RNA sequence: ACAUUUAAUGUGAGGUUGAGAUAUAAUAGUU
RNA sequence: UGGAAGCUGGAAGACGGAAUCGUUAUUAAGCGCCAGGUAGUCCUGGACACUGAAUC
RNA sequence: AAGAUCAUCGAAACGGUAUGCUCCUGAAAAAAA
RNA sequence: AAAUAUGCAAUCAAUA
RNA sequence: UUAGUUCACCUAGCCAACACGAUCCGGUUGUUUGGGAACAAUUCCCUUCUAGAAGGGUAAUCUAUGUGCUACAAU
RNA sequence: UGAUUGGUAUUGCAUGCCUGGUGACUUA
């Protein structure tokens, strides 16, 4: 273990030396702007087309062709479609079309049901308990007391996973948001929409 | 061992089929409780008990 | 800090570089230092280094 | 060895205050870079999947999840690290023997 | 039963059936049918990326390794993944995905020449 | 099934992922607890020494600060012959979450300070045998 | 620690302060009992909250405010516990630790001593109802003019009554128009002309009780999300790319991110913002399709892939090349 | 042999064909389930006619074998198996 | 009075060597434990009382 | 397979360069940085240009080259296996050249021959005219570019309990 | 990996419902 | 978030102990609690209702 | 439909100042460029394409004029105005070095 | 002398967040400079996160103690752009 | 579900500080 | 020369010389299964169960 | 789950090193007989 | 016999 | 809440887990771009065809050791 | 989403902590 040889920089080396240090990981911490993202994507595509290709690329392209043929892609027809930018999102539509009670004395469901949610309590803690934001509603189709067509529509819409045949029970879950109140509101809205769709039967 | 863990006593014990010995150290109240337990609260045949080398006021 | 202060008081530090660095780092008590975390990262390179 | 000149019994280092480790500092830098650039990589992958091309993403080589390693929190070693502890063998041993795990259900009287 | 291909429970994770008749097949057969029935799918939809897969409509071309390997690349190994995909994380039946693709493509059932149906599993 | 409750934990221990077993970790809490222990042990006695250094102007400073803040200063000093005892306290450093649990002991706190006690007969981080908690002896070692 | 110089720090003063704190805790418990008997909630607290009657809300708010006003400020504790059980138990524990513990066994049995007190057992079942018992139920029902906090509910009702009285002096129509229930939901905020978007603020405690950010408060997006029935991505559902394929892709991404856990709302917003611009400044999707399809035909022929040499041949054959324009030690020596 | 494990106590007591047997078994394998069923059948037979348990005592039908699998040891491939130790 | 419902005991392990270097055949196990116990109240009318008791029962 | 790199592009080869130079040159003029704006290094050395004449090849090699090059997609980079015939067909010409490089990285960027240098010298004024035109366009360039961001429409001023206090602001 | 484990995976596929040969070809 | 929760929290952001701040906290923690806006508005509304009975 | 129209108006008014999510894509080579050379924009006997365009920055907010030489369409060397001026200044030395190396050859 | 008493935000008797943001407790002159600079620019520092506050503090310290060439950000990003983004995100009340 | 469009978009042209020494004008006019 | 699969298989190999190792019955021996290394990767390490003896 | 029970074809019909096309992971396991 | 069409583990009836 | 806190030697092992002495640099430290061995070799060659989205053969070298995995047993 | 006071340089023949191998651990 000895000292590394010292090299006296030449005048040429000092004159042709970078005036700024190279980009570090500490600098990379700053996110890439969308302009750089797009430029990198364009450069990679151009290089790959230019000839830095691979067999995996061909296989991936064939798989994408199969997906497009089965129609599970975002490609646009040249004649059917080619020959809006602002839209109402599905959750906003659900909220807007939802009907809410005027007062706690008014019920907008009219059928038996049970609402379940989980809450966590304990000594002081710095980390929030995971898996405590979902809520669900359970009810019996017989209690709902619908016609045969409406019951079949309900079962088909909810699928076999949400239907327990042993006791004729059906459950609907909502764990789409990390907040229990938001999950409960979404659950109520979707339950109302489900009942409307069942009545459409 | 359970009694000593509860009472925060220290030292050592040694139990066998017919005898037992030990050297116990700790607070005066804890020592008195241990003495009472050994004299009256042992679930085995205790024909004789003896205490010796008692010292107090240790730093 | 305590170890270096003891060794410096007993004059057990030989290297002048070590003496200077340890004196600059440990002589002034944290409460008296104008900036407690006077430096971070490498010892001889100051914290906001754009090169390290 | 039966040391010929035994030294004093040294007090162990603090549990929560590890010594400087530039490798750990760079690991933290990589972790934060991945946290910041996670969305951009998702955008890259979305664009490539929509275009149906299996192209590389070089910037992930530097700001990706796979540049991060599980390093000992108390020792700085980058091997033999479990998520349930985040510490290496000696860090875990010191923590257990200092009595910080009795509250958290650790049972030293259990072998298996 | 020693090596019967159903397990004890007669699992059919790759089987697909048509609800209009008793016809049923598996995912590889479904992929082959999709590649063979491009003309019907294209007509219903209605040098070009749309028709790039037409050459694969020939039985002989598919029989040839030139087409058989393309068939096997398109139909991969859904029941083979990573080694960590075990226990509770074992692969599940992609029959639902295959049925959805078939229904959206409106491929015709070989035995009844219908348009929809094609539920999962075997009837 | 001869020993059911003996093997009760085997299923979770061996044949379940941690993320799906439901076992609750301890790292994210002990990490803050150890630093709390060190900070308290380092700062409490010095705080008490600083408080007791003068020991004569404590009440005067309290009176002046009460005048500055509340404007009355008669809550602690109704008359000249009333003594207001000062209890040493330290800043709270561990980000405990405020919870609706009415029995939580650190949710109704509003001052950002906690009382500190130098007396504790039972040592909390009980080591095994002769081992000493790290960071306890700052005096440099002496060799033979 | 210097010897005692002023009697303020003497032990008897400390014992007196502890006794005074315990006395104040007992006074507070007595006051709480008197308030409970003076302003009882008929039918139970939960039933009163669910019914939402003006008298019940008024009585609950009055009782809560009186308790808040009467709650003392102790000397030996810096935690102003609103629960008389907690206050009394902490005072008893402090006194026991100060002048009742002989040894470690006593310091450990302090908690059993506290739990064996009958009065504490009685007070154990008299704490306030946490909001989450009913707030999720109200949200599921769909009540937006609600508040689990009794004082807040009373304030809302009283403000509504004041506004109605302002008009009470074609008049019933105007009064109903001024009534809160008859206000359109679209008009609550100009930027969200859709109904059922704003809910009732939860009364659950928030923030960090003790840290470097003890009084930081809610974040910019947290303040907004605490006032909605549930979040929606309508903020970014505009000015989508003119290209049809990219517009469809971004719309699908927005729809999927609306129903997706593991993604923060800020993360979704930023992702959409970046993706929109990326697609906008990228080339046409159909042009990319044509170019890629021409570059990668269905069948892979020979010679269509870049040739790659062995790693050992490229690198591991000794020192053969160094890239440096200005080096004092070139490979020639 | 598994069938005999299950149905021997009926023969030993002489009640072969007198009784119809209904069994619910879970866990283990063929031989383990056979042993559990043998023990259960013996217990049921002694409950039906306690005085006839002498016929089962000698055969040891009413014995509950609590032996469990030997745990694998650290540093060993199995409970007792190990790598081949190489000298030098 | 609720209906008691005992729940099993869970465990977890982390395995480490006994030595700071070499000696892979010397190993140590760190075992953790959890316990769960469920109590069910039915047709609860005194919601406030039941919740207060349940939350104030928690110890340690 | 362990303890190795991750880049196969290094094993592969990049774009074929019009002018070939031994980089770093054995003999070259002192390197001077062109400017500090982008850290460009400039030097002068000797380069060579190679050209292949398909006519001066055997029939089999020529037909194979045509087959590989005239396909829909060029095969094998449009070359032939190296050999004496291909080497003889290829003709090399030597000429002085001017080369650029990136500082620190020292990656070769371009190589310009004397003909190119003289031609750009003669065409310098057109470069300035084009720069002036681009600078003039820069106005509308920036004007259009400043509105390229997709902005989220967020609640700028949301009051407390809007549902319960819709009193202050309201239309009709 | 091990031939036995490969055969085990093939047997798992067969149980799941995919007829694949067990020959180690 | 999960990957950015590995190491210890910063040890240079721990609050310092200052006598002035201790006295300020001691003075402030005894601050009075005013009557609630809900009750004040309730009184005002009662007066208005009595006036306009 | 009415709700969507109101939302469109509100969003446009809110986002006028900051960003409207426009696109300034022009392909490669950019259509706003300025040619350098003959009708094919080729300079020199080696037929090297050259065009001047306002290069974009990493943030996509500010642009700078730049002369780009391309081997066909792929850009190999790009020079800003300052770099071009510096090269013009240094050319006489470049000429001397090239003459010396030609004499060497 | 002595530090100015903190202003409780609402329903509190203290606030360590304000002291930390102003760099009074823990005392940190670089953080005090960061607070003053952001206040002068027009950024509501109290509304910022810990990460952003520390980033701005580090950037300002580096710029002050190494030169105006530093700090240097990739992708042609600038400290002025960062400051503008922070001002837009947290308008000063 | 009732659902085009905030302003530009010119050459065949898609690669916006070049992913880089090492024989083939190969590729995005010809060579 | 990451792992898995398929078509073909002109790779050794017929229980292995001097010598040499593991093993105390739910054990040897055989068989499968799975947590963890925070993408993929072992026949390693650590476990789990099923069949299950012989020998002084 | 396998080694099962039962019941067929059956002896180098063993063995599976080797071999470019195919599949899985990942930004990256490329070329190749 | 107008009952069934039958292989077994390493968690759960204090709940399948 | 259940830890052999046990003793002696092999100057046995670990300063590359960590701490702490001696002694050495503070560049004997950090940062950026890459590499970090054995599976050669020659777009491997040749033939046909408008082009293959075709067809055929050739292919050395690998010192020794320990441990695992997989294999060879009928006539 | 809370980073830091250099060295994986020598010295295990200076040591602490921790391990391997061999020995022991008998009382009334
Ligand atoms: Zn059919």
TrEMBL record, chain B:
What are the residue boundaries of the Acylphosphatase-like domain, all occurrences included?
Answer: 1-59
According to UniProt, the name of this protein is Acylphosphatase-like domain-containing protein
Source species of the chain: Toxoplasma gondii (strain ATCC 50853 / GT1)
Which residues of the entire protein appear here: the answer is 119 to 177 of 235
From TrEMBL, chain C:
Superkingdom, taxonomy of origin: Eukaryota
> By what name is this protein known?
Uncharacterized protein
Organism, by scientific name, is Toxoplasma gondii
Range covered out of full length: 370 to 421 of 421
UniProtKB/TrEMBL annotation, chain G:
The identity of this protein, by name, is DNA double-strand break repair rad50 ATPase
What is the phylogenetic placement of the source species in the record? Eukaryota, Sar, Alveolata, Apicomplexa, Conoidasida
From TrEMBL, chain M:
Q: Which residue windows are transmembrane per the record? A: none
Positions in coiled-coil regions: none
Q: What is this protein called?
A: Uncharacterized protein
């Amino acid at each position: 273990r000895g000292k590394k040889e010292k090299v006296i920089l030449n005048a040429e080396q000092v004159a042709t030396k970078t005036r700024l240090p190279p980009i570090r990981l500490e600098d990379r911490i700053t996110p890439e702007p969308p302009a750089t993202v797009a430029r990198n994507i364009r450069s990679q595509i151009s290089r790959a087309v230019a000839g830095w290709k691979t067999k995996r690329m061909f296989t991936y392209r064939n798989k994408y062709r199969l997906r497009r043929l089965v129609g599970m892609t975002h490609d646009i027809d040249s004649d059917d479609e080619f020959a809006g930018r602002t839209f109402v999102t599905p959750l906003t539509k659900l909220q807007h079309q939802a009907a809410l009670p005027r007062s706690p004395l008014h019920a907008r469901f009219d059928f038996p049901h049970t609402v379940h949610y989980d809450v966590f309590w304990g000594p002081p803690q710095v980390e929030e308990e995971p898996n405590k934001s979902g809520c669900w509603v359970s009810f019996r189709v017989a209690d709902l007391k619908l016609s045969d067509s409406q019951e079949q529509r309900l079962l088909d819409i909810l699928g076999p996973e949400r239907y327990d045949e042993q006791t004729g029970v059906v459950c609907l879950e909502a764990d789409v948001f990390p907040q229990l109140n938001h999950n409960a509101a979404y659950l109520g809205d979707i339950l109302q929409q489900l009942m409307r769709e069942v009545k459409k039967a | 061992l359970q009694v000593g863990r509860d009472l925060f006593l220290v030292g050592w014990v040694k139990c066998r089929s017919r005898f037992a010995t030990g050297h116990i150290q700790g607070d005066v109240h804890a020592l008195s409780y241990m003495r009472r337990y050994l004299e009256k609260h042992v679930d085995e045949s205790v024909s004789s008990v003896r205490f010796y080398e008692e010292n107090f006021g240790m730093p | 800090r305590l170890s270096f202060l003891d060794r410096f008081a007993r004059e057990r530090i030989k290297g002048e570089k070590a003496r200077q660095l340890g004196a600059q780092l440990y002589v002034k008590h944290p409460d008296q230092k104008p900036v407690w975390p006077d430096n971070k990262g490498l010892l001889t390179r100051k914290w906001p280094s754009p090169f390290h | 060895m039966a040391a010929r000149n035994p030294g004093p019994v040294l007090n162990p280092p603090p549990i929560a205050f590890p010594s400087f480790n530039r490798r750990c500092q760079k690991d933290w830098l990589a972790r934060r870079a991945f946290a910041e650039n996670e969305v951009n990589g998702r955008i890259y992958k979305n664009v490539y999947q929509n275009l149906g091309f299996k192209g590389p993403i070089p910037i992930l080589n530097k700001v990706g999840q796979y540049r991060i390693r599980m390093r000992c929190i108390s020792g700085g070693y980058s091997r033999g690290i479990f998520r349930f502890t985040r510490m290496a063998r000696m860090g875990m041993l010191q923590l257990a023997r200092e009595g910080w795990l009795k509250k958290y259900g650790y049972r030293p009287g259990l072998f298996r | 039963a020693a090596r019967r291909v159903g397990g004890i429970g007669r699992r059919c994770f790759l089987t697909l059936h048509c609800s209009a008749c008793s016809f049923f097949f598996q995912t590889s057969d479904a992929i082959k049918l999709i590649l063979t029935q491009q003309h019907h799918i294209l007509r219903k939809k209605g040098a070009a990326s749309k028709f790039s897969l037409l050459p694969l409509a020939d039985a002989s071309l598919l029989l040839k390794r030139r087409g058989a390997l393309v068939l096997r690349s398109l139909h991969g190994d859904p029941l083979v993944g990573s080694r960590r995909q075990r226990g509770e994380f074992a692969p599940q039946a992609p029959t639902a995905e295959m049925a959805k693709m078939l229904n959206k493509s409106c491929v015709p059932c070989p035995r009844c020449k219908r348009e929809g149906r094609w539920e999962e599993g075997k009837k | 099934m001869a020993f059911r409750y003996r093997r009760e934990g085997q299923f979770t221990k061996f044949r379940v992922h941690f993320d799906r077993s439901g076992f609750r970790p301890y790292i994210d809490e002990l990490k803050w607890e150890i630093m709390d222990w060190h900070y308290k042990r380092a700062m409490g006695p010095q705080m008490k020494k600083t408080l007791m250094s003068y020991q004569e102007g404590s009440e005067k400073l309290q009176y002046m600060h009460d005048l500055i803040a509340l404007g009355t200063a008669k809550a602690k000093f109704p008359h000249a012959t009333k003594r207001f005892f000062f209890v040493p306290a330290l800043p709270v450093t561990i980000p405990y979450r405020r919870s609706s649990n009415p029995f939580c002991l650190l949710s109704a706190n509003k001052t950002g300070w906690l009382q500190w006690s130098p007396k504790q007969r039972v040592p909390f981080p009980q080591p095994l045998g002769k081992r000493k908690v790290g960071g306890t002896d700052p005096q440099p070692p002496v060799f033979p | 620690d210097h010897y005692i110089t002023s009697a303020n720090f003497s032990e008897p003063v400390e014992l007196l302060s502890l006794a005074e704190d315990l006395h104040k805790a007992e006074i507070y418990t007595q006051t709480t009992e008197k308030l409970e008997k003076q302003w009882p909630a008929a039918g139970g607290v939960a039933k009163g909250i669910q019914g939402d009657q003006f008298f019940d809300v008024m009585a609950a708010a009055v009782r809560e405010d009186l308790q808040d006003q009467s709650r003392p400020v102790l000397v030996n504790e810096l935690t102003d516990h609103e629960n008389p059980y907690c206050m009394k138990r902490e005072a008893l524990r402090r006194l026991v630790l100060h002048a009742c513990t002989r040894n470690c066994l006593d310091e450990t049995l302090t908690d059993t001593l506290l739990d064996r007190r009958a009065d504490l057992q009685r007070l154990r079942s008299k704490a306030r109802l946490p909001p989450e018992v009913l707030e999720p139920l109200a949200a599921f029902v769909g009540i937006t003019r609600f508040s689990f906090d009794r004082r807040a509910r009373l304030n809302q009702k009283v403000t509504a009554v004041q506004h109605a009285l302002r008009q009470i002096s074609e008049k019933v129509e105007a009064v109903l128009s001024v009534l809160p229930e008859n206000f359109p939901s679209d008009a609550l905020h100009p930027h969200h002309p859709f109904r059922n978007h704003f809910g009732f603020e939860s009364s659950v405690p928030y923030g960090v009780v003790g840290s470097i950010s003890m009084g930081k408060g809610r974040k910019k997006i947290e303040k907004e999300l605490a006032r909605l029935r549930y979040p929606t991505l309508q903020r970014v559902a505009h000015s989508l790319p003119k290209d049809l394929k990219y517009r469809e892709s971004v719309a699908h991404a927005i729809r999927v991110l609306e129903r997706s856990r593991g993604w923060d709302f800020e993360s979704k917003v930023k992702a959409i913002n970046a993706l929109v611009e990326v697609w906008n400044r990228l080339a046409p999707g159909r042009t990319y399709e044509k170019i890629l399809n021409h570059a990668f035909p269905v069948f892979r022929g020979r010679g269509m892939v870049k040739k790659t040499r062995s790693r050992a041949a490229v690198f591991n054959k000794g020192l053969k090349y160094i890239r440096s324009l200005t080096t004092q030690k070139p490979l020639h020596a | 042999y598994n069938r005999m494990d299950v149905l021997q106590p009926f023969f030993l007591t002489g009640t072969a064909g007198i009784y119809d047997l209904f069994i619910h078994v879970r866990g283990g394998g063929s031989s383990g389930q056979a042993g559990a069923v043998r023990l259960a059948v013996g217990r049921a037979l002694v409950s039906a006619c306690p005085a006839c348990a002498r016929l089962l005592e000698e055969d040891m039908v009413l014995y509950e074998d609590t032996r469990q699998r030997m745990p694998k040891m650290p540093g060993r491939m199995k409970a007792r198996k190990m790598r081949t130790w190489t000298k030098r | 009075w609720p209906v008691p419902r005992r729940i099993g005991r869970r465990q977890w392990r982390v395995t480490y060597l006994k030595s700071p270097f070499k000696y892979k055949y010397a190993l140590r196990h760190y075992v953790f434990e959890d316990h769960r116990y469920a109590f069910a109240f039915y047709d609860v009318n005194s919601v406030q009382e039941v919740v207060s008791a349940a939350l104030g029962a928690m110890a340690g | 397979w362990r303890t190795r790199g991750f880049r196969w592009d290094l094993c592969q080869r990049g774009r074929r360069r019009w002018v070939h130079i031994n980089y770093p040159p054995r003999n070259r003029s002192t390197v001077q940085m062109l400017d500090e704006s982008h850290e460009k290094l400039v030097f002068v050395c000797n380069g060579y240009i190679d050209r292949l004449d398909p006519r001066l090849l055997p029939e089999r090699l020529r037909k194979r080259l045509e087959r590989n090059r005239k396909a829909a997609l060029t095969r094998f980079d449009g070359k032939l296996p190296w050999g004496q015939a291909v080497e003889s067909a290829i003709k090399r010409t030597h000429t002085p050249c001017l080369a650029f490089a990136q500082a620190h990285s020292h990656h070769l960027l371009e190589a310009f021959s004397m003909a190119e240098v003289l031609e750009i010298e003669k065409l310098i004024p057109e470069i300035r005219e084009a720069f002036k035109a681009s600078k003039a366009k820069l106005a509308e360039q920036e004007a259009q570019d400043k509105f390229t961001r997709h902005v989220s429409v967020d609640l700028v001023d949301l009051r407390e309990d809007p549902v319960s206090f819709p009193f202050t602001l309201k239309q009709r | 990996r091990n031939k036995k484990i490969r055969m085990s995976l093939k047997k798992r596929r067969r149980r799941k419902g995919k007829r694949a040969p067990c020959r180690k070809k | 978030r999960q990957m950015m929760k590995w190491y210890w929290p910063s040890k240079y952001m721990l609050q310092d102990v200052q006598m002035a701040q201790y006295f300020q906290m001691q003075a402030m923690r005894f601050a009075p609690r005013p009557a609630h806006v809900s009750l004040t508005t309730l009184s005002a509304t009662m007066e208005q209702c009595w006036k306009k009975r | 439909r009415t709700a969507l129209e109101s939302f469109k108006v509100a969003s446009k008014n809110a986002t006028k100042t900051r960003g409207r999510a426009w696109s300034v894509y022009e392909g490669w080579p950019p259509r706003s460029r300025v040619r350098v050379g003959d009708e094919y924009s080729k300079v020199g006997p080696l037929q090297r394409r050259a065009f001047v365009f306002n290069r974009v920055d990493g943030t996509g907010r500010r642009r700078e004029p730049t002369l780009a030489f391309c081997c066909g369409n792929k850009p190999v060397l790009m020079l800003s105005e300052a770099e071009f001026e510096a090269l013009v200044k240094k050319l006489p030395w470049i000429k001397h070095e090239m003459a010396e190396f030609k004499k060497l050859l | 002398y002595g530090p100015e008493a903190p202003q409780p935000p609402a329903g509190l008797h203290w606030s360590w967040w304000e002291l930390y943001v102003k760099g009074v407790n823990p005392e940190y002159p670089p953080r005090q400079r960061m607070f003053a600079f952001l206040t002068a620019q027009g950024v509501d520092v109290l509304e910022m996160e810990i990460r952003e506050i520390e980033d701005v503090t580090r950037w300002l310290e580096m710029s002050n103690v190494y030169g105006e060439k530093f700090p240097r950000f990739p992708y042609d990003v600038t400290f002025q752009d960062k400051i503008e983004a922070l001002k837009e995100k947290y308008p000063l009340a």
